[PDB]
A paper describes a structure:
Here, we demonstrate that the low complexity N-terminal domains of both D10 and D2, as well as the full-length proteins, can form amyloid fibrils in vitro and in vivo. Structures of D10 and D2 fibrils assembled in vitro from the low complexity N-terminal domains of each protein show that their core comprises the most highly conserved region between the two proteins.
Using cryo-EM, we observed several distinct D10-NT fibril polymorphs (see Methods section on Cryo-EM sample preparation and data collection) and determined three different structures. PF3 is comprised of residues T50–G76 and contains only two beta strands consisting of T51–V57 and A68–V70, with an extensive turn between them. The central interface is quite small, consisting primarily of residues M65 and G66, while the PF interface within each symmetric dimer is extensive and comprises strand 1 and the first half of the turn between strands 1 and 2. However, in the PF2 and PF3 D10-NT folds, some of the sequence variation sites are positioned within the PF fold, suggesting that these D10-NT folds may not be compatible with the D2 sequence.
Author numbering:
A (entry chain Z), B (entry chain h), C (entry chain d), D (entry chain J), E (entry chain B), F (entry chain F), ...: 50 to 76
């Protein structure tokens, strides 16, 4: 299984308690 | 299984308790 | 299993209690 | 299993209690 | 299992209690 | 198992109680 | 198991109670 | 098991109570 | 087991109570 | 004048001869 | 003058000769 | 004049002849 | 004039002849 | 004039003929 | 004029003919 | 004029004909 | 004029014909 | 004019025809 | 099967992601 | 099967990600 | 199977990630 | 199978990550 | 199988990560 | 299988990480 | 299998990490 | 198997980490 | 197996860490 | 005065007594 | 005065008594 | 006055009594 | 006056009584 | 006056009574 | 006046009565 | 006046009555 | 006046009545 | 006047009536 991604949060505000995963590939 | 994606949050406001995954590919 | 990703937080605000993973590949 | 990634936090604000992993590849 | 990554924190603010791992490859 | 990474902290602020590991490869 | 990495702290601020490991390879 | 790394602290600020290991290779 | 590393502290500030090991290779 | 933005390219394909500016604020 | 925006290209195809600006604020 | 931004290229493909500026603030 | 930004290239492909500037602030 | 930024290239591919500037602040 | 930045190249591939400047502050 | 930066090259590949400057501050 | 920086090359590959300057402060 | 820096080459590969200057302060 | 051809791209602009084949002769 | 051809790209602009084959003759 | 060809790139601009084959003759 | 060809890159710009083959003749 | 070719790169710019083969003749 | 070729790099710029083979003839 | 070739690098610039083989003839 | 070749490097610049083989003939 | 070759380095610059073999003939 | 052009002759037939100029710019 | 051009003759036939100039720039 | 060009003759046929100039720049 | 060029003759046929000049720059 | 060029003859046929000049720069 | 060039003859055929000059710089 | 060049003859055929000059610099 | 060059004859065939000068610098 | 050069004849065939001068510097 192949995964490809981009995860971008905010540009000015904060990031609190957040799961920013670019790509997930389970097995 | 192949996955491709882009996940973008806000540009000014915050991101709180959010799961921003670019791509998920389970097995 | 292959994973590729980019995870970017904020540009001005802080990052608090956040899991910024570029790519995850379980086994 | 292969993993590739980039994890970038903030540019101005702090990073507090955060797990910034560029790439994870379980076995 | 192969892992490759880059983990970058802040550029101005501090880094407190954070796990900045460039790449993790479990066995 | 092979691991490759880069871990960079802040450029102006301090680094306090932080685990900056360039690459981890368990056995 | 092979490990390769670079761990860089701050450029202006201090480093306090931090584990800066370039590469870890368990057995 | 092979390990290779570079660990660099600050350039202006101090280093206090910190474990700067270039490379660790357990057995 | 083979280990190779470089550990560099500060360039202006002091180094206090710090374990600067270039490379560790346990047996 | 204040500007805030996020510019994200592709997730799989390349980026060729492109001006990806997150935010522009002329004077 | 204030500007806020998000510009996202493709998710699979390439980006060629394109001006992806998140936000522009002239003076 | 204040500028804040994030510019992210591709996640798998290359970046060729591209001007990736996070934020521009002219004077 | 203040500028803040993040510029991230690819995660797998190369970067050729590209100007990756995190933030530009002219005078 | 103040500038703050982060510039990150690739994680697997090379970087050829590229100007990776974290922050530029002209006078 | 004040400048602060982080410039990181590749993690696996080479760096050829590239100008990696962490921060530039002209006068 | 003040400058602060971090410039990191590759972690596995070579560095050829490259200008890796942590911070530049002209006068 | 004040300059502060860190310049780190590769961790495994060579460094050929490269100008690795930690900080430059012209007059 | 004040300069402070750290310049570190490779950890395994050679250094050939390279100018590794920790800090330069012209007059 | 015989094939003869001439394929010419642009004279001023670039060529991006293009398959310029002078002649193709399948079997 | 016989093939004959000429493939010419640009005269001023670049060539990016392009397959310039003068002649192809499959079997 | 016989193949004959000429493949010419640019005259001023660069050539990035391009497959310039004068002639291909499969079997 | 016979192959004959000429592959010419640029005259002023660089050649990055390109496969310049004068002639290929598979078997 | 017979192969004949000429592969010429640039005349002013560099050649980076490129496979310049005059002629290839597989078996 | 017979191979004949000429591979010429640059005339002014450098050659970095490049495979310049005049002729290859596999068996 | 017979091979004949000429491989020429640069005339002014350097040659770094390059495999300049005049002719290769596998068995 | 017969091999014949000429491998010439630079005329002014250096040769670093390069494999200049005039002719290779495997068995 | 027969091999014949000429390997010539630079005429002005140095030769560092280079394998200059006139001809190699394995068995 | 600026000139840019491409001049291509035949692909199969000969070229006899012909002035093939890519670009002419008189003074 | 600036000139840029590409002049390509035939691919199969001969070139007899022909002036193939890539670019001419008189003074 | 500046000139840049590429002049390529035939790929199979001969070149007889021909003036193949890559670039001419009179004074 | 500046001149830059590439002049390439045939790939299979001969070159007889021909003036192959890469670049000419009169005074 | 500056001149830069590459002049390449044939790859299989002979060179008879030919003036192959890489670059000419009159005074 | 500066001159730089590369002149390469044939790879298989002979060179008879030919003036192969790499670079000429008159005075 | 400065001259730099490389002149290479054949790789298999002979060289008869030929003036192979690497660089000429008249006075 | 400065001259630098490399002159290489054949690799298999003879050299008869030939003037192989690496560099000439008249006065 | 300064001269530097390398003159190499054949590797297998003879050298008859030939003037092999590494460097000539007239007065």
């Amino acid at each position: 299984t192949t995964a490809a991604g981009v995860a971008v949060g905010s540009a000015v505000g904060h990031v609190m308690g957040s799961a920013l995963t670019g790509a997930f590939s389970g097995g």
